[PDB]
Each structure stands twice: as structure tokens, then as C-alpha cells.
Amino acid sequence: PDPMKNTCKLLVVADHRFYRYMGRGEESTTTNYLIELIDRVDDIYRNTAWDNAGFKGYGIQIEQIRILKSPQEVKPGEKHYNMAKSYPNEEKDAWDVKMLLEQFSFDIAEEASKVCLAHLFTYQDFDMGTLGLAYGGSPSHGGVCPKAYYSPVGKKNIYLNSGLTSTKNYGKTILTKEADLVTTHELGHNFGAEHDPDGLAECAPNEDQGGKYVMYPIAVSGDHENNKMFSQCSKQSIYKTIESKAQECFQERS
Numbered sequence: 001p002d003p004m005k006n007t008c009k010l011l012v013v014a015d016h017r018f019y020r021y022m023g024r025g026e027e028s029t030t031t032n033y034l035i036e037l038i039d040r041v042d043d044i045y046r047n048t049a050w051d052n053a054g055f056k057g058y059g060i061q062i063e064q065i066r067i068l069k070s071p072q073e074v075k076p077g078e079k080h081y082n083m084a085k086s087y088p089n090e091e092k093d094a095w096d097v098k099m100l101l102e103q104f105s106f107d108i109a110e111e112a113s114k115v116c117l118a119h120l121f122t123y124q125d126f127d128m129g130t131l132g133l134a135y136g137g138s139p140s141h142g143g144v145c146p147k148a149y150y151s152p153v154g155k156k157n158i159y160l161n162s163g164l165t166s167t168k169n170y171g172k173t174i175l176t177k178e179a180d181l182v183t184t185h186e187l188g189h190n191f192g193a194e195h196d197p198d199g200l201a202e203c204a205p206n207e208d209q210g211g212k213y214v215m216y217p218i219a220v221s222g223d224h225e226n227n228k229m230f231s232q233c234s235k236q237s238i239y240k241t242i243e244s245k246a247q248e249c250f251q252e253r254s
């Protein structure tokens, strides 16, 4: 473990929806929420022994918080992740999640190329209880350290070191304990973890064995012991990544 290359620095972005509905139209309220959430997620990462030995101390820290106070004005037929309307269906509260992650990665491309990860924090009710999305750890590429993807539609390179979290689900603000689990799961995909499968009991335990781990495909609730922790399956996947990636874009912990 290299102490000079053990931290994935983040570009955290709060859109106009997050600023209005979570930050009560205030910059201090917005940033405090985000700073505390990332610090709690960091506690899970930093304390995880990726090899079940001394390969721990790897975490995340915020490099910058971009605060989008108002919607992004767009020309007719032009789209932006911070625009007032949802896409592709303006009648819906939320964007289609896959299209929003692709749009955010397109719009943030220049900033994303200079950071370990970029994460969008929004407040929109994705269809069917979806809480977030991320690149990396998809059974498709991406995750930690900018990886270029030439977008034939966008006509430029976008980077796949991105993910997103919404703190709205089913018409209300999710609990902070639930929000921590969403961001951990999304960043888990970025770090290279795939979902925990039912077929491996060690990786998806019963409620009497501590419950499911953070990478389970169905959202926890956050009341069981395992809920906040990475399974041995996630650890094996991430351990392979960390080795191959820390030297590429990780920095010293501040």
C-alpha cells in the first residue's frame, strides 16, 4: 500500500434540483450534506481490508464541489444534465437514469479527465425505485481513473469515471443512512465491484447471518449488520482494480 497514492479524489456536483430540495437553496447546507456523506462513505472504504490483511487505508476525498444553483439554459433541441426538464420524457419527474449518466459524463468531460472520479448528486424520482447508476463493475468499461469513450453521437471523448446518486425516491427524501448506502454502492461499481449474486451465500447472507452486503442488486434499508459493508466477492473484484489503478490516479490523503 502506497501512502502517496491511496485516495481517489472526487469532483462532486450538486445540480439545481439537489441545491433546491436538499440544500434549501443554500450553498452551506448543500456542501455540508455532501462533505458529511462522502466522509461516512470514506469510513467504509478506508477501513476495508481488500485482501483481508494489511491492504486497507484506501479511500475517497472531495477535491471540489460544483454547486449548480439554477437550471442550465439550453437552446431548442439541445440537452444538458442540469437543464430544467427531464429527458427523454419531460412529463416525468426524472430523466431516464442511463441517459442522465451518459449526459453528465458528456457535459463534465473536461473536468472528469483531471480527477479520479466525478459524482453527480441529484433530486429526481427515477422510475421503479432506482437510486443511482455508475460505470465500472458491469458484467462495458469505466470506474476509477478517467477512461476515454469516443461518443459517436456526442462527436468527442467522454470519460467513464462517473456515477450518480439521487436522494429522492417514491416522492420523498431518502434517509441519510439510505443515501450513504446508495453512494457506497455506486462508488463500489466505480472501484470495480459487480453485484453480489444469490448463488454465493458468503456474498449474499440470510437476515439471521447479518443480511445482505452493499453490492446486493436490491437496495438494503440499512438496518442489518452487513448492509454497510463490502462482501468477499466485492473485495476480490476491487482488490484486482486498486492494485492496477491506485498508481494511475490516486493521490495522498489530505
Ligand SMILES: CC(C)C[C@H](CC(=O)NO)C(=O)N[C@H](C(=O)N[C@@H](C)C(=O)NCCN)C(C)(C)C
Binding pocket: 128, 129, 130, 131, 132, 133, 134, 169, 181, 182, 183, 185, 186, 189, 216, 217, 218, 219, 220
Ligand atoms: C443503492 C441501490 C442498490 C442501487 C440500485 C441500482 C444499481 O444497481 N445502481 O448501481 C437500485 O437503485 N436498486 C433498486 C432498489 O432496490 N430500490 C429500492 C429502494 C426500491 O425502491 N425497491 C422497490 C421494490 N419494488 C432496484 C433497481 C432493484 C429497484
Ligand SMILES: [Zn+2]
Binding pocket: 185, 189, 195, 217
Ligand atoms: Zn448496482
